[PDB]
Swiss-Prot record, chain B:
It is found in: Cytoplasm, Cytosol; Membrane; Endoplasmic reticulum membrane; Nucleus. This is Choline-phosphate cytidylyltransferase A. Residues 188-245 are annotated as: Amphipathic. Phosphocholine binds at K83, W112. GO terms for biological process: B cell proliferation; CDP-choline pathway; isotype switching; phosphatidylcholine biosynthetic process. It comes from Rattus norvegicus (Rat). The serine residues of the C-terminus are phosphorylated. The inactive soluble form is stabilized by phosphorylation, the active membrane bound form is promoted by anionic lipids or diacylglycerol, and is stabilized by dephosphorylation. The N-terminus is blocked.
Swiss-Prot record, chains C, D:
The chain holds residues 40 to 295 of 367 of the full protein. This is Choline-phosphate cytidylyltransferase A. One of its GO terms (cellular component) is glycogen granule. It is a peripheral membrane protein. Residues 189-245 are annotated as: Amphipathic. Residues 233-251 are annotated as: Autoinhibitory (AI). GO terms for biological process: B cell proliferation; CDP-choline pathway; isotype switching; phosphatidylcholine biosynthetic process.
Amino acid sequence: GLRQPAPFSDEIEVDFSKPYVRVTMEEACRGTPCERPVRVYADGIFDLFHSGHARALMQAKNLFPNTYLIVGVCSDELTHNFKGFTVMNENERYDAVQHCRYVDEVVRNAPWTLTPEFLAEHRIDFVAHDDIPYSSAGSDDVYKHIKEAGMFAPTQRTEGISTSDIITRIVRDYDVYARRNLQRTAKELNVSFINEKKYHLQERVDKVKKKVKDVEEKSKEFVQKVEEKSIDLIWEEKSREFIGSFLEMFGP
Amino acid sequence: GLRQPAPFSDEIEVDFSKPYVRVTMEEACRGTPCERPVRVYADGIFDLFHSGHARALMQAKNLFPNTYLIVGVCSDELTHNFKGFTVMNENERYDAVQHCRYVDEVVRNAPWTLTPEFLAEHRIDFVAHDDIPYSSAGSDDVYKHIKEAGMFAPTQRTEGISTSDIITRIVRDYDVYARRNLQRYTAKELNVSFINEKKYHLQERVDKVKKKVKDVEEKSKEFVQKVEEKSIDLIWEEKSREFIGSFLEMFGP
Amino acid sequence: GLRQPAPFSDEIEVDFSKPYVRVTMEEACRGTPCERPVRVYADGIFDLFHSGHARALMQAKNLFPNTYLIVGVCSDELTHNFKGFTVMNENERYDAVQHCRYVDEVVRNAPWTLTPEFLAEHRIDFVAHDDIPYSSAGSDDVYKHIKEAGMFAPTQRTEGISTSDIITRIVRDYDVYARRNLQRGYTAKELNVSFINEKKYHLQERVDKVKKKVKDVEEKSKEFVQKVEEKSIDLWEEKSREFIGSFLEMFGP
Amino acid sequence: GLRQPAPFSDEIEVDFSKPYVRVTMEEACRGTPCERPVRVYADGIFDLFHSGHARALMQAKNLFPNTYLIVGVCSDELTHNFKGFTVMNENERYDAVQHCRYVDEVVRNAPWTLTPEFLAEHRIDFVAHDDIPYSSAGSDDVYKHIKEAGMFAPTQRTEGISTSDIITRIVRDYDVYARRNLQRGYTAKELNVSFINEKKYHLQERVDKVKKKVKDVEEKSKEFVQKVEEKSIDLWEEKSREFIGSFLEMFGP
Ligand SMILES: C[N+](C)(C)CCOP(=O)([O-])OP(=O)(O)OC[C@H]1O[C@@H](n2ccc(N)nc2=O)[C@H](O)[C@@H]1O
Ligand SMILES: C[N+](C)(C)CCOP(=O)([O-])OP(=O)(O)OC[C@H]1O[C@@H](n2ccc(N)nc2=O)[C@H](O)[C@@H]1O
Ligand SMILES: C[N+](C)(C)CCOP(=O)([O-])OP(=O)(O)OC[C@H]1O[C@@H](n2ccc(N)nc2=O)[C@H](O)[C@@H]1O
Ligand SMILES: C[N+](C)(C)CCOP(=O)([O-])OP(=O)(O)OC[C@H]1O[C@@H](n2ccc(N)nc2=O)[C@H](O)[C@@H]1O
């Protein structure tokens, strides 16, 4: 078992009388001497440290028979820049990752993109992460070059677990709980009633409009009729009436 | 035959050393002595004097074997009062009736309603006219009392003839003739047609406008409804689902 | 007097064993022994039989001390042909003449021009008509040959009356009455149109009012919605700080 | 280092041919020969497993030179019952504890109170927890009997962290956000209502204008009609005096 936490990058003596030399998959998988383990670097936010992270690092720890696991954790600043908010700030996460079972070494304030000098500084043989492309601003995959170096080691993501999930359970519950403790009833009932009332009113208004339209149409029709009559008028008809009337003047 | 016209009432000597005595149907129909004829009175407007009148007076002249026919003709004034217009005034009608074949005597300016003193003055035995009730103002029949006296003698009206008819033929013809000589034209007709067309067009336009207005109103109503709906919606249950995901966008992809 | 109408020619018997022998102006004016009256012929349409006609016939009857008056009445066909229309129809005018006072005998269906044989069968001694030469057919006078025989007796037209006047009065009155009435109806139509326009304006007003009401309702609804929103908003901080704590109570202290 | 997770209790073999014999603070702190580590028990929900937990476990692991750390994780049922809810579910927390650095073995479905037999089967030498007396059930401390046995090893709570805080941050942020969003929508909603009201009024005005126009058109039409009527009326007297005469021409001169 292990009594003490994982050394931060800084705590350890490192020797430059030893040149930078990576191993290859073959002689790494044959497994390295105990003095010279294979050195692997996994990186990420590790916000709300959870099982997915942990067995990702387990996968990574197990890649080779003899392995030394260094884990880069990104700063709050960088993470808010390129990604979004952390619920837990960088220190909590450093502690968090420090406390993991498969972790030999923790690297604070780790870079979004990995550089030749980073890889040389920390003597990294391989880089463990999931094989999805990581698109962080300006790059479609920030692991592209490490993949190309033959350096990249893919891992598998746990399903059902993720920080987004852990956040969404809580938020989900609190939303309905809060909204529920708002309406706490008469008013709510009234509102429902009001909507119904409003609807009824709207219907009435529509009906009224329709009626008005009908009236207008009728008026138009009447006008048309009048016009027609006028046209017709414009003696043949009224002669029959003219004569009899004229002769009324002469008696019964 | 007869050379001279019928005496007006005035021209004749009349004697009051002879009391007023009417006869009755029986001894009148046995026929009277030549010195004492039966005396009968027929009356009316006699406007546009015609055959109906004439054989009415013939009927009347023939009522008894010996008969003297006096015919009352009403004045213009009275006739316009109680009846209507005459086309011919009273003098023309006096002449007219004077010239009839069966007429012995003419009575000018005769009364609408006959009075005891009229009947006594002119010594009238009987009064000849058609058996229709004559309704002249205030009375349902102005012959009622003469009918009751046993004095009345009915007559028959000729059919097809009457002053109204004689007037209506003329008026009928002149109406259509005149109206006909008015429209007398093609150009005018064309113009009228054009005007009508224009009117129709205008009407159509108006209708279209109305329709448009209606449509607008409908649209407005719809908008109002939508607004109401929105308000109702506003009045968390719906937008929570959207609130949460959005909230979690903040934490990354 | 005379109780009976005038015979027609065909109603009458005539002795032809009596040769046709006319009589002179002289020995006629000496007067004609009772059984040989002078026989005079007068002719015409007698349309709208009137007093001019009648007095013409009176002159005719009085031309001699003893005179027999035969009067020809021309047919509808002859008359429509050579003259013009008639408001009276030939039978009506036959009757008309029949009821005249100075007329002994009526001759139906009379000739437009008079012939030796016509004058023979009716044994006509003289002819009575006005002395204005009569132009119809191609004849510039149809009586000229009767003149030349010295068989003509002129008469005098009466004044202010003739069949045309009687027409003209009625005609006029009906022309002015018709036309007047024609205008009045148009005025009534104009009055109706006023009514219609006013009704349309009121309907428009009503519509406007309705629209206004609708608008008001909408406004009210909006206000209500706003109020609701406000209420919702209110429903939160203090009771929030209450909420969260309450919610964490459930998982423990 | 450590490539492998922590066993559970049931994953593990145990020799019961070895009787249950505890060890003193003293001879434990002298250090325990490799094959007999001291065995320490620490317990808890470990909901939202965090650094306070982990350091608690580190203390637990370091209580002696040679120490075996067994850690009980209470169930969802026990926990919901005697404590409150958990956002983490018992399997999740089993795993959580499994991945801790100082933890040799994990015990699933742990007791709320510890029993002689529980302490027997797991061969538990000591117990590591904070020294704040734990009040749940009716017990005002559930560790008191473990205290009295002298079997208790206190530990220290870390600072500024605990499962409740992690809740509270998110809670707060979402309260202010959700309320803030709701409020913006009310702000947006009011503006929308204003747009709706502005739309309503303009439209109404337009409608009114249209109506007015229609009315005007109608009026114009009426006027036109009137004019036409007038014209018609104008279109008779002179030609009247022409007419009547013309009409009397037909009956003769
Ligand atoms: C910024 N980079 C790209 C340099 C480092 C990667 O950044 P990231 O966002 O992948 O960090 P993260 O904390 O989300 O993921 C950390 C590691 O845990 C793994 N992981 C995460 C969640 C999960 N349910 N299963 C996992 O296996 C990821 O594959 C990743 O390899
Ligand atoms: C005023 N009165 C009642 C006193 C007299 C009658 O007035 P009147 O209107 O009957 O006079 P009139 O000139 O219309 O009718 C005169 C006479 O002719 C008769 N007559 C009239 C028209 C006709 N087609 N046939 C007729 O027999 C009527 O019966 C009446 O007897
Ligand atoms: C056709 N004829 C010649 C055979 C017959 C004469 O035809 P007419 O046109 O003279 O007939 P008419 O009805 O006009 O006239 C009939 C008679 O009435 C007389 N008459 C008519 C109107 C009047 N105002 N005065 C008259 O004296 C005429 O002299 C004529 O003798
Ligand atoms: C129910 N029991 C008594 C059987 C087990 C204890 O239950 P609990 O409520 O202490 O469990 P928990 O998850 O709250 O605490 C787990 C462990 O982490 C430690 N812990 C937790 C939070 C913190 N800020 N500091 C700590 O030292 C506690 O001392 C405890 O020993």
